[PDB]
Structure formats: structure tokens, C-alpha cells
Amino acid sequence: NATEIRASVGKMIDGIGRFYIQMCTELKLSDYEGRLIQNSLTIERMVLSAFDERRNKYLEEHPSAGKDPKKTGGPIYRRVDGKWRRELILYDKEEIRRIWRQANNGDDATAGLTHMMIWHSNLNDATYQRTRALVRTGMDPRMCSLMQGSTLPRRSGAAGAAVKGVGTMVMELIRMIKRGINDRNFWRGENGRRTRIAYERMCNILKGKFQTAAQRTMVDQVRESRNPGNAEFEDLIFLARSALILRGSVAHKSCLPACVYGSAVASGYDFEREGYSLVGIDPFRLLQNSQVYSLIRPNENPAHKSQLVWMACHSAAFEDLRVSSFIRGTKVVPRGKLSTRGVQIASNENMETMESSTLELRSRYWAIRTRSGGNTNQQRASSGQISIQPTFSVQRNLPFDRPTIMAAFTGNTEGRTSDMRTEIIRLMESARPEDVSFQGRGVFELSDEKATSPIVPSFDMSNEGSYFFG
Amino acid sequence: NATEIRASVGKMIDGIGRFYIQMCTELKLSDYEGRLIQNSLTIERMVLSAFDERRNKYLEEHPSAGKDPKKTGGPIYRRVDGKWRRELILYDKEEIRRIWRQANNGDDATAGLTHMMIWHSNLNDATYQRTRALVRTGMDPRMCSLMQGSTLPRRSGAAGAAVKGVGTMVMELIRMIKRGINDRNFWRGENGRRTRIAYERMCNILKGKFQTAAQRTMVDQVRESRNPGNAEFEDLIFLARSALILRGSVAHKSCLPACVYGSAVASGYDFEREGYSLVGIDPFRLLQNSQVYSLIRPNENPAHKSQLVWMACHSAAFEDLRVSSFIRGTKVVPRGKLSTRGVQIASNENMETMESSTLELRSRYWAIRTRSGGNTNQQRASSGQISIQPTFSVQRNLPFDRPTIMAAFTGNTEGRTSDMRTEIIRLMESARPEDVSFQGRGVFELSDEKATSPIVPSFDMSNEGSYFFG
């Protein structure tokens, strides 16, 4: 059944929206002030800090960073008769914790929290990619397209586990491997137990994310090493390099800024009644009638800023430029020639140069974001029955496709990773960059509500460049 | 206890000797005729044919080779007033089967049969080495020193399993692998069951024969292949090539010709009372007072023939020439310049040229033939405790040599054969051709009965050549 999940997501988004309304009430902000991305970012990171129990518990035992008992940050921006001002106002954790407490009818709202962490992950992935950590681990910065949800902490649950990508998991595993190489953390203490439990859980998440059998079995053989040394390091690097083409269907949750949700909730559009979806038309239908303001530097182009924020909202920073432009309706500028900077504003930059303006979010078309992979993998490995069932009682043979039956079982168990690298490189060679994917699907029009008739895109515009980076 | 085994071997050798006396009685042969190697060979191969149930059962359903209901061979040689004559006399199987039946007090005498097969194995190994089958299997004929007991059939029991060597087992396994590659004999029929049972038993015998742990574990990983293809072929070739230096202590049973046993039994030297041993001084003490005659071609050197037959009796054809000469007391001629041929005589060669003469078997010294390996392996891998036991109840640590504890268990199981080839080649590199072996042991004098004082040999005679072949 899908009605229950729809009601649950509608309920928790209604809670988030009415929390945002409560914030707009308590901050004494004007109508325009509540349509700002920056203040939503500030309050939302404040919520992240308040609800992150582990960092807090690390902090009350560590009274450092000067003024840090329980209050952090808070750069609220207010419009003064056309000009702008920034104030560093500090808020307690317990008060706003309880404001959430009645902002969700007595619940913890963990799903909402995961929504905020995921929307932060999308903003960071859209703005800045961490080539720095990649090169730190020795890992090639050519594969930044594997950095989905890198800024996410491990505190996120299964819903948060859905969005964090393959390459980010390679990075976090490499971090723990380097730590275990530096010192003997693998002893029989409770620390070793929690490390191996986390390691096996993360490997299970990995094997869930992949699609092809060969990579799944190689990963299953990865955690056989009770004492991970150096071989699994290049094993995981090659895992990422092979997942370049055999990508895992991780997630692309379409999280939206708190201002848009709050404006919708304030207008009386209760999400529980008509339902809410995070994947279909629904996150789209709020945006063509949404007004968003933000601050811009006197050199930044607002036209680029609108495209970038729509990227971040729809987590399309790692999507191809051609289809993103087709859905948007206008050409999208790659990261190479963007005359803009990060949407976050520095704490030291001067107050005079900021100017507020409206953000354009309307898009001509819409499409469903499925958590799947390209059809090319199913082209490499076709589909069909392998077994048969006797319906009539007739004296006949039972046809069994035996050579694939051994392949599923792997009768002769794989010796090491290398034998798997062999046929996975063979599959990579079988791959082609002209393999059309997602057959039977298309882009629909905004007037469509039940996905009745799509239109297939056709891109013949030479080599404009399907690479947002470079 | 060793008295029971001594009594058993004495009993079965007494049975063999009195069977030989019965044969000398029934053949109506003269005193000199019973001191011939050739007639003993003929009657003994006849016994092999009579007691080999499998070939017989293959033969009564296959009435071929003309005159072959139940009688084969029988080239008995008789001395006629100085000259010689050869007669092809044919004997039934059941009569001589029953002659054995009372020749051993109603027993089957399987141990005696194994003794005859092993003595045939020694004669064949001394005379001719099967480079032909080696090259047939593609296997290098440089390693003929691994052909111990090649002519032995698989019918031999555990006692017979002791003497058949590592390279011969490589050959028989290669034969079955080639047969299973030619046709799909690995189906679920009873034939497949008996093949896998034999294969696992022979692998168990192999792992019993080896000494070092690495080769044992690699062999244990050999039979993991449920469908042996081509990889295990070079795996077994490399097994033989590595066993070149890390040799297995297979066996060197000192079997003696039936004429010597029969002469001893006829004289009244009952073996049950004073005991018999096949490994110590005992098989030696019968030979300095043993008279043996044999036929020789007018070009063959009797001096070479005596040395070769003493080789075959003591199965020292694959022993070093220096120590063999030292124990014998005279220089031993290598196979390169032996002006003699096989002790078996062709069925087509003429009757005129044969001449009978005495065979010299007396040796100056004696030594024990242990089924062990060179001390060099224990030099590569030293000896000592690995664990400790608390004798006093004292609050103290229990010292455990952990890195070797994993090595015995192989905590990270070996991926394939290649990782084992690595360190086994490392051990081969660590090997030296100057490693003195068999420390604490020596060659004793014939006057010694209880192994009280040996004398250590010292060979400084340049490079005479410790290679019987080549």
C-alpha cells in the first residue's frame, strides 16, 4: 500500500512547515525575510546542531572554542529600508528542541531530520565537490560523480542510508582502514566489536546498492578479511572505478528548502489530505508557484544562481546538462564558466555589497526520478526465465539452464578479487558510450497528473558537454 | 609393541620361503636351478597374474590373445650338461592358488603379495625408468627420481600404498584428469562416485607423504575443485617440481628375491623364533651368506650385473652413488657406462649365448633405511615449543607464539595455488646443495647387532657424480 507512506511523509512535511512558521513568528521577520535561503540555512543548521546528540555529548565534556556551552552560530540577515544587516544571535538547544517537540505532535521527527541532512548533502554536492579528501586518500579526483551525500554523518538512518553514495562509502571505509593501519584498533575490546559491526553493516548497504552479480560477490568476498591490510584498499578503489560504469542506484531524494514548505503550509495546503510524494510530480508542483529571495554579490550573476539553486533543490548537480536543460527549458552553464560562488556567504565579507533578488525555479517539464540504473547493464546481461514449473502432469524433461545455475551459486568459489577484476574489465570493454538507457520512459508535461503520455528527448547538439565538472 | 609385527613378517616370509621350496620340489629343478633369478621371476610374475583378481575378471569375459583361458607365460630355464634350454610351460591358476592356500596355513597372504609387487617395482625402477610416460603426459623427464613404484597397480593396499611415490601419484592423477577431460566421466553415476572416492583417497595418501605445511595446505586446496580442468594439471606438475627438493618420505622397503628366502627357510632358519625385520640389519644378514646364480649375455659384464641386482634388491637405484659405493665397498658404475642390459631376458634371443654365473651380494657395511627426509627442511623450519602449560598456580602471563598460531590455522585462507607457489619458491631459494642431512646417524659395521657405534662417511672425491642417470 502507498497511502500510508504518503500520509506519513505529508504529516512530517506539515510538521516541518509549521515549525518554519513558528520560527517566522518568533524571529519577528518580515514577509520578504522568510523568503530568504540564508535564514533558512542558518536555522536549519542550528536544528542539525541541536538534534545531533553525538557531537553535543562530545561537546559538554569539551568546553572549548570560547563561547560554546550550548549556543552556536546564528547569522540572521534583516533588511533595513533597502540595505541589509547581519546579526550573530545565539539560541539555546533545549528551547528549540521543545519547539520541535510540539511542532510534530510530540514526536522526535527523525525522518524530518534526515530530510534536512539530505538537503544539506545536495547543497554541498551542488556547490563544492571534495576532491581534497579524494587526493588525501590517494583517490583520483576524476570520479567526483561518486560523491553523493559526502557531507552526511553516519547518524542518518536507513532513509539517510539510501542517499549516501558508493564513492562516499569507499571514502569512509578507507578512513577506517587507514585508522586501523595506524594503530591496532582491531583488538578484542568493545571498540573492535563496534567497528566490525559498522563495517559489515556498511558492506551490506554497499551490496544492496550495486546491481550486477559479479561486483556483489566480489564485495561479499571483501569482508572475508578479518584483518584488513592494504589489498582491500586497491580493491575498493577498483570497486569505485568499476562502479563508474556499473553505477549503483543509490538515491536522488528531491528535498526542498524550508521556506517553500513553510509558504505552502501557511497558505492552508494541508499535505495529509491530498497526499505528498517526494519522487513524483508533487515536489515539482509546489515550485512553479513558489517565490524565493536570496542575497547576491555585485559580481555574481543571478541567472546562474537560480539555475544552481534549482540544481541543489533537485539534486541534479551530477545529472547530464542536456536533459537538465531540457527539463528546465533553458541552457545550463557548467561549473567551468559559472560567474558565481557558493550560496553560503562568508562571515567576514562586508555588509554593503549584498543585494537581494528573486530566484527563478519554474521549469517547463517534469519527470519521475527512479532509483535505478542505465539499461546498458541489462543489455550486457539479458533477462528471461532460468527454471520451469510443471503445470500439466506429463512425462517430460524439466529444462534447467545449468551453466547459469552454477554462475548464480559460484560452485567453484572465487579465489581472490583478481579473477573478478578480469571479467569486470571484460564487461567494461563490452560497454559502449552510445547505449541508450531508460527504455519505455519519457518526460511528461506539467498539465499531466497521472503520467499518461510522455515525449522522448532527442539531443543532436554536437558535443556541448555532458560533464558539469571540467 | 614391535614383537607382534616382527612375528607377523617372519611368519609371512616363512610362508613365502616354503612356497618357494614347494615350487622347487614340483618343478623338479636341480640345486643350481633354484639359485636362479630368472626362474624366480617367472614363477613370481605367474603368482602375480594368478592372484590379480581384477585382470583375471577382465580376462574370462575377454577370450583373446589366442591361448589364454587361464595360463600365461612360463619360460623355465634348465641347465643341460653345461648348456641351457628354455621351455614355455603353462600352469593353471587354481592349482597354484591352492598351493599358496596351504603354503601359508590357510591364509590369503596379501602381505606377501604386496611384497612381490614391491620387489617388482624395485626391479623395474633399477632397470628402466619410464621417461616415455612422462613425456606422454608432457612431464619433464628430468625428474625420473620421482618414479618410485611406478609399475605398481592400484590393487596394492596400505603397505603397498607406502612404497608408491609422489611422482607416480602425479602421473596416475594426470591420467585420470586427462580421461575426465576427454569425456564427461564426472556425471552422477556410480562411476563418478568411485572416481571421486579414489581421487580423495590418493590425495590423502599424498598429504600423508609430504612433510612441510605449505605443500600440505596447497594439496588440501587441490581437491576443492569439484570439476578438475586444466589448472590443477600445472598445479600437480609444480607440486612434483617443488617436491624435487622438499621430497616426501615415501618408503624404501628392502624386498629380497624368493630364492634367498627359500634357501634360508630350507636350511631351518625359522624366522618366527628369532624374529624378522625388513628395515634393520636383518634383510642384510641373510645376503653375505647367500649364493645367487643368473644368466648373462657374452657381452654383459657380470661385475656390473651384481651391482645392479644388489641395487634392485636394496632399492638403491635412486640413492646417491657415493654412499651406495661406501656401503657396498666398491665403486658403483652409473647408468651411463653400464655395459649390461635389463635383467629380464627377451623371448626371441637365442639359446646358445647364455652363460650362468654367480652374483656378488656381500657388502662391507650396513645402515638403517628410515622413511624420513633430509634435515635441510628442518633447517629451513626450525623446531621448538609454541605453547606453554601452567604447572605452578602463579599469577602470570601464558606466552603464546601468535604469528605461528595463525600460520598453522591459516586465518586468512589461501586464495589460490599461486600465493603458495610464491613462498614455496622462496623456500626453494633458501635451499642449499651443501646442507648436510641425517644428523646424529651413521653407518655401522656388520659385527654390530644393536646399533651401538656408527662411523660417519666423508666424501671429498671431487665431482664423481651423485646422479645415477645422466
Short mmCIF file of all heavy atoms in Angstrom, two decimals, chain B residues 17-48:
data_model
loop_
_atom_site.label_atom_id
_atom_site.label_comp_id
_atom_site.label_asym_id
_atom_site.label_seq_id
_atom_site.Cartn_x
_atom_site.Cartn_y
_atom_site.Cartn_z
N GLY B 17 58.89 -68.50 1.74
CA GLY B 17 60.04 -69.37 1.54
C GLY B 17 59.64 -70.82 1.36
O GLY B 17 60.19 -71.53 0.50
N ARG B 18 58.68 -71.30 2.15
CA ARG B 18 58.26 -72.68 1.99
C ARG B 18 57.39 -72.88 0.75
O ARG B 18 57.39 -73.98 0.18
CB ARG B 18 57.56 -73.18 3.26
CG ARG B 18 56.06 -73.07 3.33
CD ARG B 18 55.62 -73.36 4.76
NE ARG B 18 54.30 -73.97 4.85
CZ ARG B 18 53.19 -73.30 5.15
NH1 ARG B 18 53.22 -72.02 5.46
NH2 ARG B 18 52.03 -73.95 5.16
N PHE B 19 56.70 -71.84 0.27
CA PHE B 19 56.12 -71.91 -1.06
C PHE B 19 57.20 -72.07 -2.12
O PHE B 19 57.03 -72.82 -3.09
CB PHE B 19 55.28 -70.67 -1.37
CG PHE B 19 54.63 -70.73 -2.73
CD1 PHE B 19 53.52 -71.52 -2.95
CD2 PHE B 19 55.19 -70.05 -3.80
CE1 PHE B 19 52.94 -71.58 -4.21
CE2 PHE B 19 54.62 -70.12 -5.06
CZ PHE B 19 53.49 -70.89 -5.26
N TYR B 20 58.30 -71.33 -1.99
CA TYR B 20 59.38 -71.45 -2.95
C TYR B 20 60.00 -72.84 -2.90
O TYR B 20 60.39 -73.40 -3.93
CB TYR B 20 60.44 -70.38 -2.70
CG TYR B 20 61.58 -70.41 -3.68
CD1 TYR B 20 61.42 -69.92 -4.97
CD2 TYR B 20 62.83 -70.91 -3.33
CE1 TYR B 20 62.45 -69.95 -5.89
CE2 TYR B 20 63.87 -70.94 -4.23
CZ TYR B 20 63.68 -70.45 -5.51
OH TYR B 20 64.71 -70.47 -6.42
N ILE B 21 60.09 -73.42 -1.70
CA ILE B 21 60.55 -74.80 -1.57
C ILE B 21 59.59 -75.76 -2.26
O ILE B 21 60.02 -76.71 -2.94
CB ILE B 21 60.74 -75.17 -0.08
CG1 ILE B 21 61.82 -74.30 0.55
CG2 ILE B 21 61.09 -76.64 0.07
CD1 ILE B 21 61.89 -74.41 2.05
N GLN B 22 58.29 -75.54 -2.10
CA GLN B 22 57.30 -76.37 -2.79
C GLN B 22 57.45 -76.26 -4.31
O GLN B 22 57.32 -77.25 -5.03
CB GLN B 22 55.89 -75.98 -2.36
CG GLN B 22 54.79 -76.84 -2.96
CD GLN B 22 54.89 -78.29 -2.57
OE1 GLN B 22 55.31 -79.14 -3.36
NE2 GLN B 22 54.51 -78.60 -1.33
N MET B 23 57.70 -75.04 -4.80
CA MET B 23 57.93 -74.85 -6.23
C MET B 23 59.18 -75.59 -6.69
O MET B 23 59.19 -76.23 -7.75
CB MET B 23 58.03 -73.36 -6.55
CG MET B 23 56.74 -72.57 -6.36
SD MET B 23 55.35 -73.20 -7.33
CE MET B 23 54.49 -74.21 -6.13
N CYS B 24 60.26 -75.50 -5.91
CA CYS B 24 61.47 -76.23 -6.26
C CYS B 24 61.24 -77.74 -6.26
O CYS B 24 61.86 -78.47 -7.04
CB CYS B 24 62.61 -75.87 -5.30
SG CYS B 24 63.15 -74.16 -5.40
N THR B 25 60.35 -78.21 -5.39
CA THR B 25 60.03 -79.64 -5.36
C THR B 25 59.21 -80.05 -6.58
O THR B 25 59.50 -81.08 -7.21
CB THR B 25 59.28 -79.98 -4.07
OG1 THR B 25 60.10 -79.67 -2.94
CG2 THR B 25 58.91 -81.45 -4.03
N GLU B 26 58.20 -79.26 -6.94
CA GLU B 26 57.29 -79.63 -8.01
C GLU B 26 57.88 -79.41 -9.40
O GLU B 26 57.55 -80.17 -10.32
CB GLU B 26 55.97 -78.84 -7.87
CG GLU B 26 54.84 -79.30 -8.79
CD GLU B 26 54.92 -78.69 -10.18
OE1 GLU B 26 55.45 -77.57 -10.31
OE2 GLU B 26 54.45 -79.35 -11.13
N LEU B 27 58.74 -78.41 -9.57
CA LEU B 27 59.40 -78.15 -10.84
C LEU B 27 60.51 -79.15 -11.16
O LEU B 27 61.02 -79.15 -12.29
CB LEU B 27 59.98 -76.73 -10.86
CG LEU B 27 59.12 -75.53 -11.25
CD1 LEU B 27 58.70 -75.67 -12.69
CD2 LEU B 27 57.89 -75.36 -10.37
N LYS B 28 60.89 -80.00 -10.20
CA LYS B 28 61.94 -81.00 -10.39
C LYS B 28 63.25 -80.35 -10.85
O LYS B 28 63.97 -80.90 -11.68
CB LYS B 28 61.50 -82.09 -11.37
CG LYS B 28 60.33 -82.93 -10.88
CD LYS B 28 59.92 -83.95 -11.93
CE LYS B 28 58.76 -84.81 -11.43
NZ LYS B 28 58.32 -85.80 -12.46
N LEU B 29 63.55 -79.18 -10.30
CA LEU B 29 64.75 -78.44 -10.66
C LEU B 29 65.93 -78.87 -9.80
O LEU B 29 65.77 -79.32 -8.67
CB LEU B 29 64.52 -76.94 -10.53
CG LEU B 29 63.50 -76.32 -11.49
CD1 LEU B 29 63.26 -74.86 -11.16
CD2 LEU B 29 63.95 -76.48 -12.93
N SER B 30 67.13 -78.71 -10.36
CA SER B 30 68.35 -79.07 -9.65
C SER B 30 68.70 -78.02 -8.60
O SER B 30 68.00 -77.02 -8.43
CB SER B 30 69.50 -79.25 -10.64
OG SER B 30 70.71 -79.57 -9.96
N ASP B 31 69.79 -78.27 -7.88
CA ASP B 31 70.22 -77.35 -6.83
C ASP B 31 70.59 -75.99 -7.41
O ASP B 31 70.24 -74.95 -6.85
CB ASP B 31 71.41 -77.95 -6.07
CG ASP B 31 71.82 -77.11 -4.88
OD1 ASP B 31 71.09 -77.13 -3.86
OD2 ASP B 31 72.86 -76.44 -4.95
N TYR B 32 71.32 -75.98 -8.53
CA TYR B 32 71.70 -74.71 -9.15
C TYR B 32 70.49 -73.99 -9.73
O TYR B 32 70.39 -72.76 -9.66
CB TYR B 32 72.75 -74.95 -10.23
CG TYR B 32 74.13 -75.26 -9.67
CD1 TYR B 32 74.51 -76.57 -9.41
CD2 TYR B 32 75.04 -74.25 -9.41
CE1 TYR B 32 75.76 -76.86 -8.90
CE2 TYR B 32 76.29 -74.52 -8.90
CZ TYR B 32 76.65 -75.83 -8.65
OH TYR B 32 77.90 -76.11 -8.14
N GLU B 33 69.55 -74.75 -10.31
CA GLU B 33 68.37 -74.14 -10.93
C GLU B 33 67.57 -73.30 -9.95
O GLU B 33 67.01 -72.28 -10.35
CB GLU B 33 67.47 -75.23 -11.52
CG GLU B 33 68.17 -76.28 -12.40
CD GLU B 33 68.77 -75.72 -13.68
OE1 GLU B 33 68.81 -74.49 -13.87
OE2 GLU B 33 69.19 -76.54 -14.52
N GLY B 34 67.50 -73.71 -8.68
CA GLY B 34 66.77 -72.93 -7.70
C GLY B 34 67.49 -71.70 -7.21
O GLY B 34 66.90 -70.90 -6.47
N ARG B 35 68.75 -71.52 -7.58
CA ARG B 35 69.52 -70.33 -7.26
C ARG B 35 69.53 -69.33 -8.41
O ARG B 35 70.41 -68.46 -8.48
CB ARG B 35 70.95 -70.70 -6.86
CG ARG B 35 71.13 -71.85 -5.86
CD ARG B 35 70.25 -71.72 -4.62
NE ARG B 35 68.95 -72.37 -4.74
CZ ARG B 35 68.75 -73.67 -4.58
NH1 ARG B 35 69.73 -74.50 -4.28
NH2 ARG B 35 67.52 -74.16 -4.73
N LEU B 36 68.57 -69.45 -9.33
CA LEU B 36 68.50 -68.58 -10.49
C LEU B 36 67.51 -67.45 -10.25
O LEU B 36 66.44 -67.66 -9.67
CB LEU B 36 68.08 -69.38 -11.73
CG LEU B 36 69.06 -70.44 -12.24
CD1 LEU B 36 68.43 -71.22 -13.37
CD2 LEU B 36 70.37 -69.80 -12.68
N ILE B 37 67.87 -66.24 -10.69
CA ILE B 37 66.94 -65.12 -10.60
C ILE B 37 65.79 -65.30 -11.59
O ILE B 37 64.64 -64.97 -11.29
CB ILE B 37 67.68 -63.79 -10.83
CG1 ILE B 37 68.72 -63.57 -9.72
CG2 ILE B 37 66.71 -62.63 -10.87
CD1 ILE B 37 69.67 -62.43 -9.99
N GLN B 38 66.08 -65.83 -12.79
CA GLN B 38 65.10 -65.85 -13.86
C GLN B 38 63.89 -66.72 -13.53
O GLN B 38 62.75 -66.32 -13.75
CB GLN B 38 65.74 -66.32 -15.17
CG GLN B 38 66.80 -65.38 -15.79
CD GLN B 38 68.05 -65.18 -14.94
OE1 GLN B 38 68.12 -65.57 -13.78
NE2 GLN B 38 69.05 -64.54 -15.54
N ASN B 39 64.13 -67.93 -13.01
CA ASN B 39 63.00 -68.81 -12.70
C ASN B 39 62.16 -68.25 -11.57
O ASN B 39 60.93 -68.35 -11.59
CB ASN B 39 63.50 -70.23 -12.38
CG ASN B 39 64.36 -70.30 -11.13
OD1 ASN B 39 64.50 -69.32 -10.39
ND2 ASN B 39 64.93 -71.47 -10.88
N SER B 40 62.81 -67.63 -10.57
CA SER B 40 62.06 -66.96 -9.52
C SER B 40 61.20 -65.84 -10.09
O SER B 40 60.04 -65.69 -9.71
CB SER B 40 63.02 -66.41 -8.46
OG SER B 40 63.87 -65.42 -9.00
N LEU B 41 61.75 -65.06 -11.03
CA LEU B 41 60.98 -64.01 -11.68
C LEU B 41 59.77 -64.60 -12.40
O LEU B 41 58.66 -64.05 -12.32
CB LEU B 41 61.86 -63.25 -12.67
CG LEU B 41 62.98 -62.36 -12.13
CD1 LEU B 41 63.93 -61.97 -13.25
CD2 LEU B 41 62.38 -61.12 -11.49
N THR B 42 59.97 -65.70 -13.12
CA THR B 42 58.87 -66.30 -13.87
C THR B 42 57.76 -66.78 -12.95
O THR B 42 56.59 -66.42 -13.14
CB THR B 42 59.39 -67.47 -14.72
OG1 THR B 42 59.99 -68.45 -13.87
CG2 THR B 42 60.41 -66.97 -15.73
N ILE B 43 58.10 -67.58 -11.94
CA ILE B 43 57.09 -68.08 -11.01
C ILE B 43 56.43 -66.94 -10.26
O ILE B 43 55.23 -66.98 -9.97
CB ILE B 43 57.69 -69.13 -10.05
CG1 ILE B 43 58.62 -70.09 -10.80
CG2 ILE B 43 56.59 -69.90 -9.34
CD1 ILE B 43 59.53 -70.89 -9.89
N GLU B 44 57.18 -65.88 -9.96
CA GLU B 44 56.64 -64.79 -9.16
C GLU B 44 55.67 -63.94 -9.97
O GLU B 44 54.61 -63.55 -9.47
CB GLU B 44 57.80 -63.96 -8.61
CG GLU B 44 57.42 -62.84 -7.69
CD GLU B 44 58.64 -62.11 -7.16
OE1 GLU B 44 59.77 -62.48 -7.54
OE2 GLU B 44 58.48 -61.15 -6.37
N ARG B 45 55.99 -63.66 -11.24
CA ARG B 45 55.04 -62.98 -12.12
C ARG B 45 53.82 -63.86 -12.38
O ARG B 45 52.70 -63.35 -12.51
CB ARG B 45 55.72 -62.60 -13.43
CG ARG B 45 56.71 -61.45 -13.31
CD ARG B 45 57.12 -60.93 -14.68
NE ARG B 45 57.84 -61.93 -15.45
CZ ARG B 45 59.16 -62.11 -15.40
NH1 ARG B 45 59.93 -61.36 -14.63
NH2 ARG B 45 59.71 -63.07 -16.14
N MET B 46 54.02 -65.17 -12.46
CA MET B 46 52.90 -66.10 -12.55
C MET B 46 51.98 -65.97 -11.34
O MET B 46 50.75 -65.96 -11.48
CB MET B 46 53.44 -67.52 -12.69
CG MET B 46 52.42 -68.63 -12.85
SD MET B 46 51.77 -69.12 -11.25
CE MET B 46 53.21 -69.96 -10.59
N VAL B 47 52.56 -65.88 -10.14
CA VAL B 47 51.77 -65.68 -8.93
C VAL B 47 51.02 -64.35 -9.00
O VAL B 47 49.86 -64.25 -8.60
CB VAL B 47 52.65 -65.77 -7.68
CG1 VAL B 47 51.83 -65.45 -6.44
CG2 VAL B 47 53.27 -67.15 -7.56
N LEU B 48 51.69 -63.30 -9.49
CA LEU B 48 51.03 -62.00 -9.62
C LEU B 48 49.81 -62.11 -10.52
O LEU B 48 48.74 -61.59 -10.21
CB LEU B 48 52.00 -60.97 -10.19
CG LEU B 48 53.31 -60.64 -9.48
CD1 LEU B 48 54.01 -59.53 -10.25
CD2 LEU B 48 53.08 -60.26 -8.03
#
